[PDB]
Ligand binder design. Structure first.
Ligand SMILES: Cc1cc2nc3c(=O)[nH]c(=O)nc-3n(C[C@H](O)[C@H](O)[C@H](O)COP(=O)(O)OP(=O)(O)OC[C@H]3O[C@@H](n4cnc5c(N)ncnc54)[C@H](O)[C@@H]3O)c2cc1C
Ligand SMILES: Cc1ncc(C(=O)O)cc1O
Length: 369
């Protein structure tokens, strides 16, 4: 009976744990936090990620209570510039905790051993995981899913391309306030861009009949637009049609202005150690594939470990097989971000939807564009 130690309780670690447990592995997941939770307010999942949920036996709990907008619409200075539906390509919007809970309940129903207040501080390719307390654990597989700043990764030393975004955003969950919004298509995802009179953007994303996921984006150099709690006035001014929701968002005293970083490594494996999720490939959010690829990769890792080969060879086989999809997605998303391509609309092209089109279960590309 094989034993795996997963460091990190995020979407990647939870995905890895569940997939491994389903294949007969004895698995223990380590979460440094005192409780299992997810941050970031809301999240978009596509066909590729939805398929992972199916393979994990956690799709039903996710679909129930999540939302698929009639269309993905883009605005530039309040003028609708595009409405995209991706030719039937499945996608979904939900609060992060809704997705996190589905994964945690499944992990528990499976008998995955989850340890809170357990922080991994080092990993040995020979198959050993060291915790912050000094306690050393041995296993046949060590999974580094501890996000950006991954101690598992840095304890081993990987060649890393790092970049940090100077600009960030404020992500919040507020009431739909649908009736107060009056006439409109308020069930759609609406990416509201603006460069004049100021650079302010709001990604409007309904999660269900009760919750709305908002992303208020302004330059870090904007003292008003980047402030938290939100400077109500500055947002209502350029997004008056959302005052009802903005008024509610202004009451959230814990809102935060988050920046992000991207990560590209020369490799994702070392001996019996495999890096997954942000720890291995954090990317720009343009294509909304950060978690999608993380879940695909974590799930794919379990598949390669079912070939009858050594864990070491399975890991290199895993990277070689699945990595290209993430590299291209990460590269394209970076290009979109730098050129602000999404502001033009109709940018979810076949190339952009490549990762989303991938079906990890059958290991083929579906929903052609
Ligand atoms: C602004 C923004 C918007 C985004 N929108 C989307 C989207 O719409 N759709 C999408 O798919 N992706 C999106 N992403 C990307 C997505 O958030 C990430 O790819 C994903 O959540 C991270 O996966 P993870 O589980 O590896 O990381 P984490 O999310 O942080 O995994 C690590 C977890 O392990 C714990 N941990 C950390 N260190 C240790 C340690 N040393 N020992 C034990 N535990 C530890 C932490 O508590 C943490 O929760 C977005 C990213 C940004 C920045
Ligand atoms: C879902 C999503 N899409 C695009 C961005 C971006 O910052 O360009 C952020 C998102 O959460």
């Amino acid at each position: 009976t094989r034993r795996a130690e997963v460091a990190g309780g995020g979407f990647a670690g939870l995905t890895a744990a569940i997939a491994l447990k389903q294949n007969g592995w004895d698995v223990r997941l380590h979460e440094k936090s005192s409780e299992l939770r997810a941050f970031g307010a809301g999240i978009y999942l596509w066909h590729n990620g939805l398929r992972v949920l199916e393979g994990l036996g956690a799709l039903d709990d996710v679909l129930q209570g999540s939302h698929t907008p009639p269309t993905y619409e883009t605005w530039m200075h309040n003028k609708s510039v595009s409405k995209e539906t991706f030719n039937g390509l499945p996608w979904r919007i939900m609060t992060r905790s809704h997705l996190h809970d589905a994964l945690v309940n499944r992990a528990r129903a499976l008998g995955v051993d989850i340890s809170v207040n357990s922080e991994a501080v080092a990993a040995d390719p020979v198959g050993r995981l060291t915790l912050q307390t000094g306690e050393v654990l041995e296993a046949d597989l060590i999974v580094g899913a501890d996000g950006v700043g991954s101690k598992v990764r840095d304890s081993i030393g990987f060649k890393q391309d790092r970049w940090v975004s100077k600009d960030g955003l404020i992500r919040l969950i507020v009431p739909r306030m649908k009736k107060e919004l009056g006439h409109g298509e308020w069930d759609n995802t609406i990416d509201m861009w603006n460069f004049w009179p100021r650079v302010q953007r709001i990604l409007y994303s309904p999660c269900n009949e009760n919750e709305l996921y908002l992303g208020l984006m302004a330059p870090a150099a904007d003292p008003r637009g980047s402030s938290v709690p939100i400077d109500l006035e500055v947002w209502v001014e350029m997004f008056p049609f959302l005052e009802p929701c903005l008024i509610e968002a202004a009451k959230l005293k814990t809102a935060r202005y988050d920046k992000y970083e991207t990560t590209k490594l020369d490799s994702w494996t070392r001996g019996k150690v495999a890096l997954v999720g942000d720890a291995a490939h954090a990317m720009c959010p343009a294509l909304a594939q950060g978690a999608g690829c993380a879940m695909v990769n974590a799930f794919s890792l379990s598949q390669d470990l079912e070939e009858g080969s050594s864990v070491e060879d399975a890991l290199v086989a895993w990277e070689t097989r699945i990595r290209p999809i993430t590299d291209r997605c990460q590269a394209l998303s970076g290009d979109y971000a730098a050129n602000r391509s999404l502001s033009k609309g109709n940018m979810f092209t076949p190339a952009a939807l490549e990762a989303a089109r991938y079906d990890p279960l059958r290991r083929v590309y579906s929903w052609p564009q």
